[PDB]
């Protein structure tokens with residue numbers, strides 16, 4: 001084995017650079033290194049609140065990315081366009097890092113490594129695909145079994161249970177994978193109090209955070225996905241007012257331009273998997289926020305070449 005090795009058992013920036021090149025070249029991180037990253041990141045994540053609260057000073061910025069779905073070569077493109085993560089270049093990846101795309105192992109271990117390297121500046125929120133029943137079906141479990149073992153997959157599954165469910169910036173912008181709730185009256189403190197270290201239930205706030213979608217008309221509708229709901233602009237307005245928020249940022253739906261701004265400004269979708277499944281032909285985007293101006297700034301990007309492995313090859 002001549003691949004990347006941790007230094008004194010820890011991630012360093014040189015390790016991360018070596019890992020990204022190793023993965024670009026389609027090689028595998030040694031299982032002992034992968035294991036170390038997973039046990040360390042489980043410990044880091046298990047200390048976090050279900051609601052991560054982040055303050056951006058006036059001169060600070062943060063980048064918000066939506067789903068990435070194992071599109072590792074597109075993830076590298078994000079870092080090339082926008083800079084590597086660092087204490088002065090923070091990131092939030094808003095769930096759905098795995099499944100569908102066939103470089104899910106590379107995406108997730110790269111993201112976990114950066115979480116370890118910059119724990120206060122690199123943030124990962126859970127998506128509906130960071131769950132066992134979805135991974136069983138949509139590629140990630142197959143991919144982990146092919147590259148490592150069933151035991152490694154069980155460890156991933158346990159780490160995913162500790163991913164936080166939402167993040168609030170400056171008490172003003174709330175970020176979650178799916179959306180808002182099937183019932184009125186949910187507060188930020190209710191979100192803080194969710195015991196999240198589990199597979200999601202099929203109803204309730206934890207389910208909604210990972211699964212809901214906005215709809216244009218007022219009200220709520222039964223979701224076409226079979227779980228959670230669609231929520232209208234009235235739902236969003238009431239939630240923002242009770243919680244003294246400005247708007248939400250969510251992901252969870254593919255958008256041809258990489259983003260959408262619904263509910264009159266109040267519900268933003270960002271989606272960071274361009275040409276999803278090598279077929280959708282969509283652009284992707286990421287958002288910049290700044291402590292002096294929390295309004296979203298959108299940066300669009302398009303897909304880059306990857307090795308010839310088909311999406312869902314492991315599903």
Ligand SMILES: O=C(O)[C@@H]1[C@H](C(=O)O)[C@H]2CC[C@@H]1O2
Nearest residue numbers: 067096128129252253254276
């Ligand atoms: O997040 C989702 O549920 C959607 C799909 C999925 O994750 O299964 C994929 C395409 C649009 C969104 O990302």
Ligand SMILES: [Mn+2]
Nearest residue numbers: 067096252253
């Ligand atoms: Mn998705």
Ligand SMILES: [Mn+2]
Nearest residue numbers: 096127128252
């Ligand atoms: Mn999703």
